[PDB]
């Protein structure tokens, strides 16, 4: 697992990319890692609606 505790306060204007990693030998819990425009990486809760909003907005 690349995430211990999830973060908050990430606006869509600061996100550069989002990577969703499914469960497997690496980790038993689904993970979402967002790369911001400043290079920092933020861990997001997959169950939170915010991640779904970000992803659906991006895909559009």
């Amino acid at each position: 697992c690349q995430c211990l505790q999830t973060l908050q306060g990430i606006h869509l204007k600061n996100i550069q990319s989002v990577k969703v990693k499914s469960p497997g030998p690496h980790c038993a819990q689904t993970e979402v890692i967002a790369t911001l425009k400043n290079g920092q990486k933020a861990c997001l809760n997959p169950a939170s609606p915010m991640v779904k909003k970000i992803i659906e907005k991006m895909l559009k």
Partner: protein
């Protein structure tokens, strides 16, 4: 599945470490040559002609470009880790001095045209406006370098190291392609055409002359034109190839991208030599500067 897979960027540390030494060598040579040209011109105020003023401005531009080179070398080593402020500042300085050098070469060409072709006519008297022409050229260069300052930041990728790139919004690619028109028209085409016209007519007048030093002047003109072409034509050809590829004019593939990237790197190295070669071609190829330099050394 292999039909649709991401293009993986290709790199070679073998050239990454070699580019550092190339840039350092060019830095040292440009520093020394431009410093000597400046010292020789500024030591004695006697015999300060239009050509001396043009050469002094050109030496200033080349010295500033060389002074920016080392930061570019370190960036090539490890990517732009220096922040956004230095990205903007160094980019502005580099591009301002690039435009200044090109336009000063064009001005020198026009000056020589007016001095040789219209030597008997009254138009030669118009070449006494060196100070304001040089000031206008510096102003135009500063104006043309604004987009670099306005739209540049450190962009972080996921497969490539951070780069002092542009950020113009969702359509940054197309806007960047359009902004490429300025360096290719006010940076290659217009100066190239001015130089070609001026030096072609200058050569036509010299060839029909009866001087004993016509031949050396013709050789120097040929060398100037050939050095300009060698320095700048390959880079602009590669840039045009990239612009055509991005617009789907030429079919796009991973290998073609790698080829264009390697060509861009090589041609940037090649074009960076103008700062080193200008002092030898424009300043120390004439007897006046060599005599002055020998005088100062005493």
């Amino acid at each position: 599945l292999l039909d649709a897979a991401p293009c993986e960027p290709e790199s070679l540390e073998i050239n990454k470490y070699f580019v550092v030494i190339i840039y350092a060598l060019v830095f040292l040579l440009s520093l020394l040559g431009n410093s000597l040209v400046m010292l020789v011109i500024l030591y004695s105020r006697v015999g300060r002609s239009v050509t001396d003023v043009y050469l002094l401005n050109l030496a200033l531009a080349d010295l500033l470009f060389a002074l920016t080179l080392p930061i570019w070398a370190a960036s090539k080593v490890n990517g732009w880790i220096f922040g956004t402020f230095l990205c903007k500042v160094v980019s502005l300085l580099k591009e301002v001095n690039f435009y200044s050098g090109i336009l000063l070469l064009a001005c020198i060409s026009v000056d020589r045209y007016l001095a040789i072709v219209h030597a008997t006519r009254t138009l030669t008297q118009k070449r006494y406006l060196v100070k304001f022409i040089c000031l206008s050229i510096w102003g135009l260069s500063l104006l043309l370098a604004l987009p670099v300052l306005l739209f540049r930041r450190t962009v972080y990728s996921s497969n490539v190291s951070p780069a002092c790139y542009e950020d113009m919004g969702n359509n940054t690619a197309n806007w960047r392609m359009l902004l490429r028109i300025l360096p290719q028209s006010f940076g290659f085409i217009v100066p190239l055409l001015i130089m070609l016209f001026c030096y072609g007519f200058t050569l036509r007048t010299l060839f029909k002359a009866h001087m004993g030093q016509k031949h050396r002047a013709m050789r120097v003109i040929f060398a100037v034109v050939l050095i300009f072409l060698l320095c700048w034509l390959p880079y602009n050809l590669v840039l045009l190839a990239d612009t055509l590829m991005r617009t789907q004019v030429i079919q796009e593939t991973c290998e073609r991208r790698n080829h264009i990237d390697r060509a861009l790197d090589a041609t940037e190295i090649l074009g960076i030599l103008h700062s080193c070669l200008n002092p030898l071609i424009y300043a120390f190829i004439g007897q006046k500067f060599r005599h002055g330099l020998l005088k100062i050394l005493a």
